[PDB]
């Protein structure tokens, strides 16, 4: 049995990348195709906001002067920034707009670590130059979906619904591929979509790491 | 007979959960069965799940 | 971020020895089916055995 190995992590986009596996044994194909999307769509470390801080808003429901959206959908737009951490697991990004002008999601103050990768994502439309929102935002780790809810506390903080989940379209096709001169050697490709914040390549990588782990339930190392 | 009447306004924020009534509109009223993982959910070609 | 629970052959209530029935503990959802359909496909598709194949 011929192990798969990664070969190409083509770069599309910086929204999504396939990547593509040269060899694999007939019937495995479509196995390690499936395992691998449902353990990605599943279970990815995602980076989601998690509680945001309005400056001079109590409640969620509040419409600050100045933004030309509700604080609600506000968090609606928040709760898919796409951001990623590299050194922390939870961090707290500070943001201070003024003037009239979308607030795309490049105004945030971020760090040398916390870097955003959709600069554009715009948030709220300031319209006014003597308005300004200043946001708190809290962003942590995770995996999965976490609703605001079911995570077991002053009155500015809006706890917003966690969306921990780097991939948003996963999409396997196997092939065949004449590996040296065998036939049959399905080669495999991952048409994976994640929204910018998780390497392709590093992802499968994770994937892998977590089926293997899972795995060994039952079987010795 | 009344001094003063306080009004309170609770604002909750309900969502899809296993039973919610929920139709179309050509009559196909139906009920919410499973919140099924995305995972588990039927996808084509693209991988787009429905 | 990434621990995950891992059972360990909780029941593996053999009836005969030909036919046994393995149940494990709970895992993550999405994750049984990931594991048994992976494992049918497996064990389905191919495995190193030797049986007749003509006479």
Same mark, same amino acid.
Not at chain 1, 89 to 97: A, F, G, M, S
Not at chain 1, 122 to 141: F, G, P, W
Not at chain 1, 148 to 172: K, M, N, Q, W
Not at chain 3, 23 to 49: D, K, Q, V, W, Y
């Given at each position: 049995? =011929? $192990? ?10 910086? #929204? ?46 509040? #419409? ?10 506000? =968090? =609606? ?19 201070? $707009?003024?003037?009239?002008? +979308?607030? #795309? ?13 959709? +600069? ?17 935002? $809290? ?10 809810? #079911?995570?077991?506390? +002053?009155?500015?903080?809006? =706890? ?10 996963? /999409?396997?096709?196997?092939? /065949? ?9 399905? $080669? ?11 390497? +392709? ?15 060994? /339930?039952?079987?010795?190392? | ?50 | 971020?990434?621990?995950? *629970?891992?059972?360990? @052959? ?8 030909? &036919?046994?029935?393995?149940? @494990?503990?709970? *895992?993550?959802?999405?994750?049984? &089916?990931? @594991?048994?359909?992976? *494992?049918?496909?497996? *064990? @389905? ?11």
């Amino acid at each position: 049995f =011929l $192990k798969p190995r990664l070969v190409d992590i083509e770069q599309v986009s910086s #929204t999504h990348a396939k990547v593509t596996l040269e060899p694999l044994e007939r019937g495995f194909g479509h196995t390690l195709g499936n395992a691998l999307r449902r353990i990605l769509l599943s279970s990815m470390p995602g980076c989601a906001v998690t509680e945001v801080e309005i400056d001079g808003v109590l409640h969620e429901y509040s #419409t600050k002067e100045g933004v030309q959206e509700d604080i609600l959908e506000i =968090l =609606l737009n928040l709760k898919g920034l796409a951001v990623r951490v590299q050194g922390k697991d939870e961090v707290i990004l500070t943001l201070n $707009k003024s003037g009239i002008g +979308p607030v #795309t999601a490049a105004d945030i103050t971020h760090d040398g670590d916390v870097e955003i990768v959709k +600069p554009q994502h715009v948030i709220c439309h300031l319209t006014d130059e003597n308005a300004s929102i200043s946001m708190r935002i $809290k962003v942590q780790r995770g995996r999965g979906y976490v609703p605001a809810s #079911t995570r077991i506390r +002053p009155i500015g903080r809006l =706890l917003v619904d966690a969306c921990y989940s780097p991939v948003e379209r996963i /999409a396997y096709n196997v092939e /065949a591929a004449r590996v040296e001169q065998r036939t049959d050697l399905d $080669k495999l490709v991952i048409e994976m979509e994640t929204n910018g914040t998780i390497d +392709p390549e590093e992802a499968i990588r994770r994937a892998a790491t977590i089926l293997a782990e899972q795995l060994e /339930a039952f079987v010795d190392l | 007979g009344v001094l003063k009447i306080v009004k309170v306004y609770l604002a909750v924020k309900r969502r899809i959960q296993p039973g919610d009534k929920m139709a179309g509109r050509h009559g196909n009223k139906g009920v919410i069965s499973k919140i099924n993982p995305i995972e588990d959910m039927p996808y084509d070609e693209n991988g787009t799940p429905v | 971020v990434t621990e995950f *629970l891992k059972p360990r @052959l909780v029941d593996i209530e053999q009836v005969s020895s030909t &036919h046994a029935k393995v149940t @494990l503990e709970p *895992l993550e959802r999405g994750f049984g &089916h990931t @594991l048994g359909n992976a *494992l049918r496909r497996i *064990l @389905l598709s191919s495995m190193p055995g030797c049986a007749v194949t003509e006479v």
